Design a binder for this molecule. Sequence first.
Ligand SMILES: O=C(O)CCCC[C@@H]1SC[C@@H]2NC(=O)N[C@@H]21
Ligand SMILES: O=C(O)CCCC[C@@H]1SC[C@@H]2NC(=O)N[C@@H]21
Lengths: 322, 322
Amino acid sequence: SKYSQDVLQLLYKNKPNYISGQSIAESLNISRTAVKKVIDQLKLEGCKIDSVNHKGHLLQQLPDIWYQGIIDQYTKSSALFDFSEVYDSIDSTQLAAKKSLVGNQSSFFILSDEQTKGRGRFNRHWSSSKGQGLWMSVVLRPNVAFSMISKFNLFIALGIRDAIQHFSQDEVKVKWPNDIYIDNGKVCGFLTEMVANNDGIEAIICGIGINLTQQLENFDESIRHRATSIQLHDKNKLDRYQFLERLLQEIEKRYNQFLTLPFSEIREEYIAASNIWNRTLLFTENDKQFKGQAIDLDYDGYLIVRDEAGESHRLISADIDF
Amino acid sequence: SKYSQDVLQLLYKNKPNYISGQSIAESLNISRTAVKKVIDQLKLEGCKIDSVNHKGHLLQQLPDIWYQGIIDQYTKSSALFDFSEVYDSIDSTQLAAKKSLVGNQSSFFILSDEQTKGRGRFNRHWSSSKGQGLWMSVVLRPNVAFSMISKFNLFIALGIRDAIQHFSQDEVKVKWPNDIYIDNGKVCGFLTEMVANNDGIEAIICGIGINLTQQLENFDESIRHRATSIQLHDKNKLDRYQFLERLLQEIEKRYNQFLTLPFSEIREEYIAASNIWNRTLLFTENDKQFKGQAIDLDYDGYLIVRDEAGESHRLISADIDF
Ligand SMILES: O=C(O)CCCC[C@@H]1SC[C@@H]2NC(=O)N[C@@H]21
Ligand SMILES: O=C(O)CCCC[C@@H]1SC[C@@H]2NC(=O)N[C@@H]21
């Protein structure tokens, strides 16, 4: 409805306290009896609101839907993001982001419940079902030379890992350069792209897909043995609005780190985090395909690999399989 | 009008021959007497059409307006470009291009008679008056690593130079890395940007502004001593549709060269072309500003400079003043 969001906003801003139909009706400037329709609807949409007589309304729990109104609260308190955009379904949050960044310098992010044409690295299909995962592109505006994309990718990786870790009983590791794993289920994939030129970057557009609320039965086939959600490694229910909040919090931390520190400082931690050593790796390079071993990550973000034929390579990027 | 373009198309396709109101009327499937309005209008818009009784209509000369219909002919015969877009006025042909490239792989270009918000390097204002200059962004899809932007810039430079040269009595030189000069008037500036990621470029978007039909009196102030048009170095009238045709022809040649040759091969020619040696240069780098001498362009597109304090720099890019 026309007013739904503003209602949800007031409801949210007012926790841990109740507020009266009355009090809402004065703010939004609409009938006491319209606020009831709006509420009776929000509940029907799966909202948990406690309504008690004489006292009013308290927002208890939100469903697995993103609401522009409440996501406005995050953008508001943010010291990073100007605005956000929220859709229930779009073609792709990266495509949207790439459109929205032109002729302005805003930092911002875009969430969508469902993607109908979401892609990953190399333009692989990316599965993005309604109400199941956080599908989001983020735009930032670092003031750096274009060479520095690679580092961003590494820092953010730890942001996305921690955010996810704080919610997982099992250990969450990073599979360089782009994937986040819990055990041998890929929980999230992310991708960093830039608009840039000869001297200075115009924007960064990091697209992030994390699987939130998936049962084993939801995946297939046969990805079911190398894909896992967050929920499947957390005894208690996973709150999408709570995860968002830490994810954004960590994305920020790691952005600033990126902005003020050379990699070396992060390096040793990134190692503790990676699950690529002491196992055979499966590298692809256009027509060519080979095996090899991850030996080390050097100070510049590059991966030092020993291919099965004994030769040493120093790689900026790669796509790797277990 | 609704049909104007299709008329102009037939008119153009039929040179050096006349064609009858009749013959047009059958193709476009409209009254013989509507074709007359369309023609009487095209003339009034500054078209030169010869109409003789019993014989018909011949397209003699086009004004200083771009027409989507005739520009369709170039895109059609092209072995490079899928389509084009033509506007009489837009915000910026780069902005437009950056929007139009998303979620597709088309190669294409965009022309506009006037820009209301056209920018150059570092987001400097770029003057783009109606009917006076070729204002165009071009999109290509090379299949190369993102590092290779720099080279593209160098090759295209010679394309844009030759295209312009064939029309100038005075010698046309390239001021590395982005400007085209005739004597000490900047005739054109161009800029190469990319959308790309860790492994592979998504698109190139080279934006090109060349001054076509400017009198000294049109410029100011006081750019009038370091800016010059093409027309001011050509005794005979400059045809915007004829220049476009060679420009596109050269852009293509030089693109293919880029695609199949290392720089070294172009290098020595690029030198004959540059007007940066044996004079003092004025380099800017963020807060810092210094003098120096252009000593050489090495095989990798980099400029070897000797700053006034005797130190040697190897530069990928720079902004330079005379
Ligand atoms: O291929 C991968 O390794 C990761 C793909 C990352 C996809 C995310 S989902 C949200 C955003 N929208 C997209 O189109 N892609 C990113
Ligand atoms: O600053 C320079 O040195 C050159 C500027 C190049 C501007 C051209 S004009 C057509 C296209 N549209 C733009 O916004 N810029 C390029």
